Every structure is written in structure tokens, then in C-alpha cells.
Amino acid sequence: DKLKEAETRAEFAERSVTKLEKSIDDLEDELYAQKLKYKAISEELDHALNDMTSI
Amino acid sequence: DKLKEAETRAEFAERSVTKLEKSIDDLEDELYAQKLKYKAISEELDHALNDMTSI
Amino acid sequence: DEDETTALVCDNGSGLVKAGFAGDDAPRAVFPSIVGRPRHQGVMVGMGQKDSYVGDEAQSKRGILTLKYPIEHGIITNWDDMEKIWHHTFYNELRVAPEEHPTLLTEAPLNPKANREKMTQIMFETFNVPAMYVAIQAVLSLYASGRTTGIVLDSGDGVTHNVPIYEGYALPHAIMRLDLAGRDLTDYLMKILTERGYSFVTTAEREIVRDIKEKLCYVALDFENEMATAASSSSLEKSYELPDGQVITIGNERFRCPETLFQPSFIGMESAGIHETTYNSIMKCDIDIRKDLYANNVMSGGTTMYPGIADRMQKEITALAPSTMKIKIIAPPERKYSVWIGGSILASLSTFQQMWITKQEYDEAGPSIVHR
Amino acid sequence: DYLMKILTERGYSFVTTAEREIVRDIKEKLCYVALDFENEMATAASSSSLEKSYELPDGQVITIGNERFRCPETLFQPSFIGMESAGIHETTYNSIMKCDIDIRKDLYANNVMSGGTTMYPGIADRMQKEITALAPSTMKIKIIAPPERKYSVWIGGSILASLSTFQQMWITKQEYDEAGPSIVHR
Amino acid sequence: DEDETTALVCDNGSGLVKAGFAGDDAPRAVFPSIVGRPRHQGVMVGMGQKDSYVGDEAQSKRGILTLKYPIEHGIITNWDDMEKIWHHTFYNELRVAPEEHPTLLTEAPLNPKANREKMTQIMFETFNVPAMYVAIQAVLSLYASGRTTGIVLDSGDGVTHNVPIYEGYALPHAIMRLDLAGRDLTDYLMKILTERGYSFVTTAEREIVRDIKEKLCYVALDFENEMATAASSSSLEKSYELPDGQVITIGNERFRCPETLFQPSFIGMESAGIHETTYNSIMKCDIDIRKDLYANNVMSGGTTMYPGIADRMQKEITALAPSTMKIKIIAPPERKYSVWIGGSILASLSTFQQMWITKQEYDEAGPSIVHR
């Protein structure tokens, strides 16, 4: 009986780890996408703040 | 005997899930920090492109 | 393959539908057994006017609809709204056309003869399925645990049952029904948790008390000196983080909720509890079959999943049963789908083909044919 | 009108109507909503190069250092003007704990700002921190303040009314002459 | 006389305290349940610096103090501020010394065990009363209407309740609480009256909307064809003269305000209303006791005073109850003090002496003693 319980929970803990590992890779990837989509708008920015201080 | 094996492995799977869950929460939090640090620079931007088109 | 692939298994519950293909190991589709009807005229962006909503879209949009439950206590109470849940199951959830798939359905323990004939009338005459079959739920649960004689304590969302089965025939006069289940149990936790000094105020607070019940609730053995333990205050406590930060703590109540299943008195119920009822079913059966039932207490249903349910039941009936007896409480891990899995097995089986009620049988014998 | 008084109170006079009108152009150009309005007054005192002088219709260079932000601190503290009502951020919040529970994560991540008076720079940062610190930490806060916000309302109408699908919601004289004013009232 | 004269009865509410001597017919003291704390340093002419203000001096001086309500929804939420309201009641309002008076207090329907023990701890240990007793509010209301079995719809300033009582024991599992009461009701009138094209701008405009609600509001029976009546515009209208001349007219809204108690949807409440809730309490009770509860719907509380409340409720539950049943809605005239009067009767009674918890019981048994 201790067994059915230990095994059933091992299976649930493994299903939850694969679920959370799958959600960590999607957030970490959505990420370098966000972190990069920015260097571009922050750099378009030092530029688009410098020309109106000049005009 | 099947038991010592199912339990020991369950413990290792649980240790790995808590490790990966801890790394998903740090990336997802480093995240709303990045995603938000931007709404601010992209909005500071529609603004800092609108006043020089006006000046 | 014609129908090896093709058999569908639909288990209709009071809270959830479980559905999928005979052959699979678990239900392809699981969703609430609701049918929402919009309280006001209007639309979602990009959609048309919808007359009705079913399953999760009814739950998600519950604030603008009047929600209705077709199955009260395991029995189909509204046939207009049930044909709606079936329609949704075939066409949207499993995305199959029903007119080329044999369909194994389930019914409840003492399901009125007339209902088994009515869902047959609707299966064959409005969905035009090739063939169908209605199995009794406890009977599929037992069978999914390999055996043919045993007694199933079956407990889901609106009903609890005890169905003693002998060489496959569920024993009508020994079946017991207790109308207190997981639904009742979430609402009691609710109060002992607001009573712990809390507030489940918005609907995002309400719904998650149920996810607290599922994740953190326990059935302690020696529930007596577990309250006593609570008081010395060990590291028995357990804090859950809400949709936001609001870390709620649940130490003790954690097990006061499933102690409701042994003590219905916790909720103003005067009925007997799960273990006594297991037993009473058993001293209502033939004498010669009582050693069999005792060594084969199979558990199935979402509400029998509370850890330590089996140990408490083990000791609950040992101590009521004559000592000459062998007690044995089987509680498998997949038990929230036992019923369904028993249907998947049975309907994919090599020998079941000759029990399918075909449109030939029906068009020729009337609903009586499948009724048995 | 509050800036007016804290600026006459700075030792000034908006005497003719050409003095009155331009206090409003001072408010628009030079006013700020500081985050940590607390240690901004403190900053004012050490007297940094926080000050800001505006040249009037004529030469009369008026200086506004500090009051510059004491004016939008009125939106968080109505007590600055003898108002007993709650302020902008608390009110954002109270609206939110008056709504259904399940919809409160949505509202919190979508605080859209519109209107001429929400244009004071740093309004969004102050509001950001104002409601984070009132909201349960499990929550995501998000204060959207677009640049064109003094015309959000109008632009939303321009979009909607030029839209391809809106044609079927226009109340026509046919609807009206036949249904009475009730028709458009919904 | 020792205590025949000497028993005090203090009914603690969400909006008002009602207090006085057991024996009297009505409360000697009635005042708001607030505790004001001055926002600035300074004094009134001739007085000293005051740290705190309670009751009417807190209301009258509200512009310089931060007002706080100790009892949220009938439950004591702040014990520092409650001991302040009690102090005020004994020493200033009733001007008695508490250490020679037995004190009957009241609590709410499902008042947490721990609170009944805490106010006992404060009554005996900081006020040093000889003896005390905590009665449940609906239970005193019932009893003040002579009977012992009935169901009380109790509705005051912050809570509404239904407390089914059988031979004196309030039935825990059948009690319903609806957090919408007279406070909610004054604020809704406020809006339908500003919405009538008005302005309650200064604080002398705010306060009197509540006096409009009390004097001119109605609960119409057939609220349907009362709106219809409003339109034909009969001499149904009613103008009230403000602190000054400013004659304000209220025709219609007059009853749109108590229709909120049957339709919570008027105020963005999704909960059921008063009459349905009376009923649901009743189909949650034992079967054999349901004819009793139906013929004994006792009403108490300030918000149940709206004329025609009883007729609407009469017809509201007749038409939900099985026709074999006798409906009977008792609404006495003194109902804004039922609770208190029931306590006055009980505590001045000849047989109650043997239920008083004495300092002997307490110093010997701990707060547990009175908790029951």
C-alpha cells in the first residue's frame, strides 16, 4: 500500500517537473526575444532624443 | 525491494522539480521586470518622437 | 479498426464529463458539466450572438450567464441541456462526427429504467451513432482494477455510492447512496477557512478554495490525536500563495475537511458516513459473498483521492468487521478516471463487439433493447 | 487655480488677464509628478538645479523651482486643496476592489490613462508604485500612459467609426423616425 | 433588587449601540458605534486635549478626526476601539460603575468561539463586572416576540441574517448571512437621488439622505406595477424640506431603494435576496421543523422597518413555499429594538439568575466557561 502511494506520487511529481520545465523553457525563450526587441527601441531612443535636442 | 527503488527515484525527481521551479520563478520575475522596464522606454519613446516632429 | 479506433467513451458526471477514445489510457476531454445561458443581449468581440455556452466557456464567462447543471446527483435531470453537453463533446471536444463512431456511455447505480431508454432514444435518434452501450459506473471502476467481484465506494462531485458487484452483476438491493461529495466538501472548507479569519470575496478567491482542497487536503488516520497534534503546533501547517502574493495559511483544517466524509455531522448531515456505509452495504448482501466484498473494497472517484483515505478506511472497517475476516482497500492512483478507463478497456476489447446495441437492434426492438 | 495661489504665495502677482491665462501654460510646460514627493521637497531645500524660470508675455522672468510638483501632488493628496475625498491611486484601487474577483488581475495589468491632466511627466511611475504597494504582491501591476493621451478618447472614436464593422451599429434616421430616442439609448 | 435593577443590557451593532437596564422597555442609550481619533493637535474652547472621541461626539466633530468602526458586519474587528465604546457606554452614557452590575451582552450569529471568549476576558478582567452573559442576537429577537421556534430575518446596519431557531437552539448549519443592509441602502438612495438631478454636496446634505430613507421610504408590494404607477404620475410623489428651504422631491425612488433588498442586482450584488434567502435557510433545515419556521418568520432590525416589508415578504415566500403550508411574517412595531428588548426580558427574568457567568465561574474555569 505504501507502494501504490510512493509510485503514484513519484509519477505526479515527474508529470509536474516536465510541466514546469516546459513552462521554464517557454518563458526563458519569450525572453531573449523581449531582452533583444528592446536593445533596438532603447537605441532608436538615444537617437530619437538627440535630434530634437538639436533641432 | 521495488520500493527502495521507487521512493529514492521519487525523491530525486522531486529535488529536480523544485530546482527547475526555482529557476522558472527567477526567469519569469527577471521578466515582468524587463517587460515593464520597457513599457516605460517605448512610451517615453512615442513621446520623445512626437515632440521633435512638433518642435 | 473500423471501430477498434472508433469506439468513444463518455463518462457523464455531476461535475465533470470525461471523454475520449476506447484504447487511450486516460480521457482526451475533461470539462465542467454546465450549460450557460446569457443573462443579457450582446457579443464578444469578433463573435456572433451565442445562445448557449458549455463546459469551460460557461465557467469562464459565468458572470453574464445563468449556469445550469444537467446532472443532479449522477441522474440526468434536464434532457435539453444534456443533449447540449453531448453535442459539445462530440463536435467540439473530440471533433468527431458521431454517426460513424460506436459510443459507450455510463449511467449511475440505480438509474431509472426510463432514463437508460431515453439516452438511447437521443443517442440513436438525434445523434445517429452506429451503435452504443450503457455501462454502470461502479462496475467499470471495478473491472478497470482487474476484478469482477468486489464492492466499489464511488465518490465524485455530487454523489457517493457503494455498489457491491458479484461476477459482474451489481447488486441492486445492497447499493447505498450518500448525497455528500466533493462539491459539498469544497463549500465546507470554504467556511472553515473564512472561519480561520479569511475572505474569499471575489470569484478569483472562491474558485481557488477548491484548488486548496485538492492540493493540500488530507485524510488523517487517528483524526483524534491529529487535532491534538495541531495544538502543540508542529510543522503540520501549510501556506498556499493565492492568484497574487496573499499567502494564506492552512494548518489544521487541511484534514477537518475530509473528516467530513466519516462524520457527516460536521455539516449538519444526520446520515451515516463512508466506512459505516461500506459496511452496511456488506451486511445487506449474501453471507457467503461477504468475505469477497471485504477483501475487495475498490475506491474510485475524484473525492476518494485525499491521501490517507485508504488507511483510514482500512482501519475503519477492520474494526467493524468480524476478526476472522480479511479486509482489503484497493485505491489505485488513476482513480479519478477508473470509471472511464474501465470503459476504455471494455469497449476496446475483443469480446465486447457482440454486446454493442446496433441501430439494427434499435430500429427493430425500440429503446427496450438496450435497457436489458 | 491651485498653482496660481502657490505661485502668488511664492511672492507674485497675476494681476492682468495676460498674467492669469499663462499660469495655465506654466502648469502644462513646467509641471511634474514626482515619485517620492517626500524627498523631493527635501531636495528642494538643499537647492539643487531643480528650479525653473519661465519668461512671461514680456521680460518678467518668473522662477518656479519647487511648486512645479506641489501642483500634481494635489492629485494624490486632495487635502492640499481642502478636499476630503480620496486621491487618484486609492480611487484606482477602490474601483478595483469593487469589481468581480476573477477580473481583478486583468484590471491591474491594464491601467490605461487618458486625459489632459494625466500628461504631467512621472504620473505613470508614481501611479505604478502607488498601486503596487496597495495591491496583493501576487499581482502584476501595469500602468499604460500613451503619448497621444490628451486625445485617446478622440482617437478611439476615429478608429472605431472608420472601422469596417461599425457600420451596422450606426443609429440611422430610419431607426430613429421609427423607434423614438429610445433606439440609440440602448 | 441587588441585581433585579442592576442588570445591564448592551447590544453592540455595526452602526448603533443600544444600552440600558434590564427591566426598561427600550434602550436608555442609543448612539453610533464609532471612535474618532483627531487628525490634528488642538483643543475645543474650555476643554483639554482629547485623545479620542466616541459615539455622537465623534460624529459631530468628524471633520477633524479619523473615524473608525470597531464592528465590521456584526463581528468585533478592533478590540482596542471596542473597549473604548464599552467604556463610554458604562461610564458616560449609563453613568454606572460596571463593577457592581451584571452585564448581558449580545453577539452575532456565527460569532467565532474565540471572540466570545475575548469579550469575556475584557468584561471580567478589564471592567471587573460581577457577572455577565452573551446572548445570540436573533435568539433575543425571537424570544421578545414571545416564541422559541421560528426563523428570524435580522437586518441592521452592516449585516442581514436568517437564523432558524428550534426550542431555543439557533441552528448553525441553516443560518445565512447577506452583507447588504441599511448602510448599503442609504448609499444607493444617495445615487438614485443625485441621479434624479440633485446634489448632496456638503456634509449637511450627505447625512440627511439617511433621514429621507428612514422617513419616506417604502417597500411596495407589486413593485412591478408601482413603477408603472409612477409613470401615470399619481399623487405618489413626496417632497421633503432640507436643513434650509430647498424642497427636494422624491416620488418614485422612494421604493426603488428597499426593492434593493429583494433585488441585490440593483447594486451590483450577485447574491440572492432576503425572501429567497428566508426560504433557502428553510429548505436547509429538518423537514419536520419546516412547518414551524414557516408560520414564524419574525423580523427584527432597523432596515426591516420600511413599511410594507412584511406584505411583500408574505407574498414572496407564499409563492415559493408548498401550498399545503401556512406562511406567517411577524414584524412587531418596536422591531428596531427587538434584540435589546429580548435581552431586557430575559435578564430581568426570575429564572435567568442561574445562567449568569460569575467571576467565581471565570476565575476558576477560564474564558472557556461562558463560551459554552
Side-chain angles (χ1 to χ4, degrees), chain E residues 38-80:
Chain E
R39 308 216 301 290
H40 302 95
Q41 297 298 124
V43 300
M44 305 294 287
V45 173
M47 241 78 59
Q49 267 271 6
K50 255 251 181 189
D51 71 300
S52 192
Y53 272 104
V54 178
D56 305 87
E57 261 215 298
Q59 199 55 212
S60 68
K61 291 175 161 61
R62 52 190 188 270
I64 46 156
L65 326 160
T66 30
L67 287 212
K68 294 164 306 300
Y69 279 85
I71 289 182
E72 259 248 285
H73 285 314
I75 297 306
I76 292 152
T77 285
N78 184 26
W79 295 95
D80 148 280

Side-chain angles (χ1 to χ4, degrees), chain B residues 32 35-36 39 43 46-47, chain D residues 140 142 144-147 149:
Chain B
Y32 263 168
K35 194 164 197 70
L36 289 184
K39 278 186 171 309
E43 276 179 334
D46 52 63
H47 266 356
Chain D
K140 181 168 178 284
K142 186 174 179 59
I144 301 88
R149 72 192 173 281

Side-chain angles (χ1 to χ4, degrees), chain E residues 299-358:
Chain E
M299 241 119 54
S300 66
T303 285
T304 76
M305 297 275 341
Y306 301 116
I309 185 141
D311 299 314
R312 234 281 206 154
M313 264 298 251
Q314 240 286 351
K315 272 306 292 131
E316 265 282 44
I317 63 158
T318 29
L320 236 182
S323 299
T324 39
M325 204 71 66
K326 181 168 178 284
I327 266 43
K328 186 174 179 59
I329 321 304
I330 301 88
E334 357 63 70
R335 72 192 173 281
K336 57 170 172 161
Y337 305 135
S338 279
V339 173
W340 190 89
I341 292 168
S344 193
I345 282 154
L346 175 71
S348 60
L349 241 275
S350 331
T351 16
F352 186 76
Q353 198 262 58
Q354 26 287 145
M355 293 73 111
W356 282 115
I357 294 318
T358 59

Side-chain angles (χ1 to χ4, degrees), chain C residues 176-195:
Chain C
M176 309 267 110
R177 167 175 156 152
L178 180 66
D179 292 359
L180 83 78
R183 189 179 282 174
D184 301 68
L185 263 48
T186 295
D187 289 18
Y188 170 69
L189 167 58
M190 196 69 150
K191 85 98 186 166
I192 49 182
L193 203 45
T194 66
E195 187 190 85

Side-chain angles (χ1 to χ4, degrees), chain C residues 62-63 200-207 241-247, chain D residues 96-105 108 135-140:
Chain C
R62 52 190 188 270
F200 304 102
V201 263
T202 53
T203 199
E205 315 294 53
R206 149 79 226 203
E207 191 152 71
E241 182 157 282
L242 248 83
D244 76 289
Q246 235 282 238
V247 280
Chain D
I96 292 173
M97 259 71 196
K98 254 204 179 186
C99 279
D100 161 21
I101 334 80
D102 294 297
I103 76 176
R104 305 210 224 306
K105 66 277 170 282
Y108 275 115
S137 299
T138 40
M139 204 71 66
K140 181 168 178 284

Side-chain angles (χ1 to χ4, degrees), chain A residues 1 5, chain C residues 153 218-227 255-266 273-276 278 297 299 306-320 327 329 331 335:
Chain A
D1 64 37
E5 286 191 332
Chain C
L153 168 102
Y218 278 31
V219 174
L221 42 146
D222 188 27
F223 259 140
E224 164 191 76
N225 283 278
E226 194 58 7
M227 293 294 235
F255 64 71
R256 310 200 293 122
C257 181
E259 204 169 1
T260 313
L261 288 173
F262 301 107
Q263 295 97 142
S265 44
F266 279 29
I274 253 58
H275 63 285
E276 270 196 59
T278 293
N297 224 100
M299 241 119 54
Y306 301 116
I309 185 141
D311 299 314
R312 234 281 206 154
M313 264 298 251
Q314 240 286 351
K315 272 306 292 131
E316 265 282 45
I317 63 158
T318 29
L320 236 182
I327 266 44
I329 321 304
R335 72 192 173 281

